[PDB]
């Protein structure tokens, strides 16, 4: 049955358009006042229908050569398990990660941290060690528009007054990068290229974009394997994973410079560039190394019709890492034919996620470049959606990125594959974490000598400093369960 796009929060299907975004993390201090205030908040929430209407209007204005308006910033809302509990909404949503919460789950994710008995505390900024009940987030074109809309929302809940119904835990801000690199993450790689197409939503999937059933993103829609276990109010909500991911840019650049791929005919500079590309799975431009393994192709990169049409063929069963290491980030996070082809012919639609990241922080300074060391915080406000954190984000992190034997272990489960004997892909070098913070390695980066590993520097390139798992309910869920 068609999706009710008026009922779905707009960041899930569509995505809030932005140059800047604020995430406001709160605790509920007076439940019944919160629910009364929620009634006034709900009409401000951007829906998926709204996303489409707004984007068509901006396009039409541009075609008509009308000057642009100040767009109102857009707002969405999401609640943690702790917040559901505080509100007396006690239905089990059938996601172990969400229910556990990210502060405890971060031990298994591999985050740095310490233990006192069985109690793990991740090495996070202080506010993310507190119980967080929800997030209100506001996206827009400039700081003024976001701040105006956020102040209006805060006013609804009486924030900072003696009649508040919530309190600020903390807030974080994202900002796209300057100029032509605005959609490049801070390591320099174009981000946001590959997402699953969603049946009943994406009417014209791109070449190479296999569409998946909407229930892999939205609870209780077609394809949600847990639909019968979940409460009716959960229909058309999605699980929002937030990760506050600091990046160590100069350190990564130093790594690459210190480990150029030695290949006949390449200079040190070109070998270092190729290494970066091979660790990610794309050149900085976005061109996929599977299509262009020897050198960048900026024209390919810029063409959405071509830049994602690859599946890794049968390179895994052949043991062939010449075009792309097995442990490249994109391959660790969306395996394509590594799992979907023979021997497994696996259905990994439940491993798909929709990402809505935005960068944070200033550009690398001259002193940082000279020093080859980070002096300022910068990174990614990682956000992804799916109908199961257990199947998606958590699984990806623990079972794929953190698993040095993946994807060899998965395919040799089915039968012996002699070209894979002894092959140990290693960690995803962007996000892979080793519990206890020990030695990580990555193999397959030199196309001529796949067996050689690089042992990564002990400072991980990405450092998590906070996070939580939330559920973004539908508009009718908010009206009926969250409001009076
Ligand atoms: C600072 C941290 C991160 C950086 C710098 C980063 C960077 C990138 C880049 C450059 C791409 C390729 C272009 C694209 O398809 O968008 C990408 C793809 C992707 N990443 Fe990340 N990433 C980060 C964190 C994460 C995390 C934490 C996860 C999941 C646990 C994740 C999952 C994905 C997925 C699913 C894709 C798409 C793969 C595909 O469909 O080909 N990434 N990442």
Question: Residue 469 forms beta bridges with which residues?
Answer: 241
Within 158-258, where are the H helices? 249-258
Q: Which residues are annotated as a binding site for heme b?
A: 192-194, 329, 336, 355, 382
Rounded to a whole number, what is the largest CA-CA distance in the chain? 70
What determination technique applies here?
A: X-ray
Return the DSSP state at 47. B
Residue 170, phi then psi, degrees to nearest 5: -170, 175
**Are the C-beta atoms of residues 15 and 48 closer than 8 Å to each other?**
no
Within 325-467, where are the H helices? 329-333, 337-340, 366-371, 393-395, 408-412
Exposure b/e, 449-477, CB count within 10 A at least 16 = b: ebeebbebeeebbbbbbbbbbbbbbbbbb
Residue in the block written with tokens 């190394």:
289
Q: Which atom of ligand 1 is nearest to the CA of 379?
A: 1
| Residue 373 domain boundaries | 1-484
Peptide bond into 407 cis (omega under 30): yes
| Cα distances (Å, whole numbers) of residue 132 to 15, 78, 118, 126, 474 | 23, 11, 22, 12, 20
Mark whether 320 is an active-site residue: no
The token duo for 225 is 């394997």
Note the resolution in Å, 1 decimal. 1.6
Pocket test for ligand 1, best of 333, 394, 427 (most atoms within 8 A of CB): 333
Which three-class secondary structure state does DSSP give residue 443? Answer: strand
Domains identified in the chain, total number: 1
Binding site membership of 431 for ligand 1 (Cβ less than 6 Å): yes
**Are the C-beta atoms of residues 75 and 137 closer than 8 Å to each other?**
yes
The token duo for 296 is 């960048």
């Amino acid at each position: 049955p068609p999706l009710d796009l008026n009922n779905i929060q707009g960041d899930i299907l569509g995505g809030l358009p932005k140059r800047t975004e604020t995430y406001f993390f709160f605790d509920v201090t007076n439940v019944d006042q919160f629910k009364a205030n929620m009634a006034h908040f709900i009409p401000h929430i951007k829906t998926s229908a709204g996303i489409i209407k707004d984007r068509e209007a901006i396009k039409e204005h541009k075609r008509q050569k009308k000057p642009g308006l100040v767009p109102m910033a857009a707002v969405n809302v999401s609640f943690s398990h702790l917040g559901l509990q505080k509100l007396g909404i006690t239905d089990d949503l059938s996601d172990n990660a969400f229910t556990t919460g990210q502060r405890k789950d971060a031990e298994i994710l591999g985050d740095p941290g310490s233990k006192n008995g069985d109690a793990f505390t991740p090495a996070w900024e202080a506010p993310f060690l507190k119980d967080i009940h929800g997030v209100i987030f506001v996206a827009g074109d400039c700081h003024g528009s976001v701040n105006k809309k956020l102040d209006e929302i805060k006013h609804i809940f009486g924030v900072g007054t003696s009649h508040a119904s919530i309190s600020e835990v903390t807030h974080v801000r994202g900002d796209v990068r300057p100029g032509d690199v605005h959609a490049h993450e801070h390591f320099g790689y174009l981000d946001g290229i590959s997402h699953p197409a969603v049946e009943q939503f994406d009417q014209n999937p791109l070449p190479g974009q296999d569409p998946i059933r909407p229930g892999f993103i939205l609870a209780k829609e077609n394809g949600d394997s847990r639909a019968a276990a979940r409460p009716d109010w959960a229909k058309d909500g999605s699980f929002l994973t937030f990760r506050y991911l600091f990046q160590m840019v100069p350190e990564f650049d130093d790594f690459l410079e210190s480990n150029p791929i030695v290949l006949p005919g390449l200079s040190r500079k070109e070998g270092s560039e190729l290494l970066g590309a091979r660790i990610v799975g794309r050149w900085k431009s976005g061109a996929p190394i599977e299509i262009t393994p020897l050198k960048d192709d900026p024209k390919l990169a810029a063409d959405a019709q071509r830049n994602n049409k690859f599946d890794f063929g049968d390179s895994l069963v052949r043991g062939d890492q010449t075009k792309c290491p097995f442990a490249a980030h994109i391959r660790k996070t969306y395996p394509r034919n590594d799992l979907e082809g023979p021997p497994l012919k696996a259905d990994i639609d439940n491993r798909r996620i929709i990402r809505r990241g935005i960068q944070f922080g200033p550009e690398v300074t001259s002193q940082e470049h000279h020093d080859k060391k980070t002096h300022h915080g910068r990174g990614l406000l990682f956000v992804c959606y799916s109908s199961s954190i257990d199947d998606g984000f958590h699984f990806i992190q623990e079972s794929w990125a953190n698993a040095p034997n993946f994807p060899v272990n998965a395919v040799t489960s089915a039968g012996p594959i002699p070209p894979l004997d002894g092959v140990v892909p290693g960690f995803d070098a962007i996000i892979g974490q080793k519990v206890g913070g020990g030695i990580r390695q990555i193999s397959g980066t030199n196309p001529n000598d796949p067996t050689t590993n690089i042992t990564l520097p002990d400072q991980d390139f990405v450092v998590p400093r906070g996070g939580e798992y939330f559920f973004s309910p539908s508009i009718t869920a908010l009206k009926t369960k969250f409001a009076i």
